[PDB]
Symmetry: C2
Subunit: 208 residues, 2 copies
């Protein structure tokens, strides 16, 4: 049975939990809380299951896969239904473009011990500028790719990266007023079951 190594409000592991929920794969979560006295990701316990020192990893089918997006595409390739990528290559590129922008273009610029090394004073204003310049970019894309959801009228890998990123912007008190397509898409997905049963307000690494 699949095992996932995750951090309850880690944006990137929420992505995998949504994908597991959408595919209907039962999975065990193994907590690793990442900031309690340098967290268990500076445990050099977690730093060679996946040497990147970070979230997530999925053991499945007798292998271990790191990187949220690589895991999600693995699940897409091996459990097709329901599809997380459209069939048309041109729209698949919109999905990957958007997810890469969030996963590689926005999230790295706001990751947390990115901002332990910033200097506490500049932690937030750098994450805010990062999310605003990204959301400035993203809204612009979604206004032509989006339909009901980020790409068209089906939930895709792009939406799995949207919801956790929008959750961070709110945590950083970033004003989504300028971003109506992002806001609207986010509301429509948060009413779906798989974005709820996976929510950081619904997961394992988690005290009272």
């Amino acid at each position: 049975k699949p095992i996932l190594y995750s951090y309850f409000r880690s944006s990137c592991s929420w992505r995998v939990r949504i994908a597991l929920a959408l595919k209907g794969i039962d999975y065990k979560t193994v907590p690793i809380n990442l900031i309690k006295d340098r967290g268990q990701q500076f445990s050099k316990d977690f730093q060679a299951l996946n040497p990147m020192k970070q979230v997530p990893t999925l053991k499945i089918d007798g292998i271990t896969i790191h990187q949220s997006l690589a895991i999600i595409e693995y699940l897409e390739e091996t459990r097709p239904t329901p599809r997380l990528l459209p069939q048309d290559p041109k729209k698949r590129a919109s999905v990957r473009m958007i997810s890469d922008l969030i996963a590689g273009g926005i999230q790295p610029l706001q990751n947390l011990s990115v901002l332990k090394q910033v200097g506490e004073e500049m932690q937030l204003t750098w994450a805010q500028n990062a999310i605003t310049c990204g959301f400035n970019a993203l809204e612009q894309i979604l206004q032509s790719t989006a339909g009901i959801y980020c790409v068209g009228d089906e939930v895709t890998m792009a939406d799995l990266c949207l919801v956790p990123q929008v959750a961070n912007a709110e945590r950083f008190k970033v004003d989504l007023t300028p971003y109506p397509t992002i806001s609207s898409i986010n509301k429509r997905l948060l009413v779906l079951e798989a974005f709820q049963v996976s929510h950081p307000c619904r997961q394992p690494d988690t005290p009272t």
Copy 2:
């Protein structure tokens, strides 16, 4: 005919040019120099080119694709031969894991709009630490995935991200002695034609 927007030492456009060369797609490059006069990256010309203000964008088949890895996977799906991804889904995940680690995990901590923010003095100590902690992670993945190349004995998308990242490490005078699998694989790819005709010293945005 396909148009690509690139910058001489831009790592992520070097990735796309390697994939075009491997796929045998002749393409026009259009330079956009990203440091000349605040660079062509802060031109709000280039900032809806690719809305995240960065390299690359590929015009092809009547659409616009941003994000190197999203462009590469489009090229893989629409020009199958030669494969940039193995057929076995388990091996596709190692490719994707490695590529995401370089593209989203290593380069974002040392990119140009990264260390505008650092401050002149610790620019270089930070980029070196980022690459060393990333390559420390990467070398260990490569020790079970690698064969002749990053994954097995065929060139994959993982190798297209390796070569430009290794170029970054060398520019930052990062000592590759601890990383023998990376150096060996990098040399074996550097003798291949598609990693040459794409090489920075073989592209358009060209002063002396």
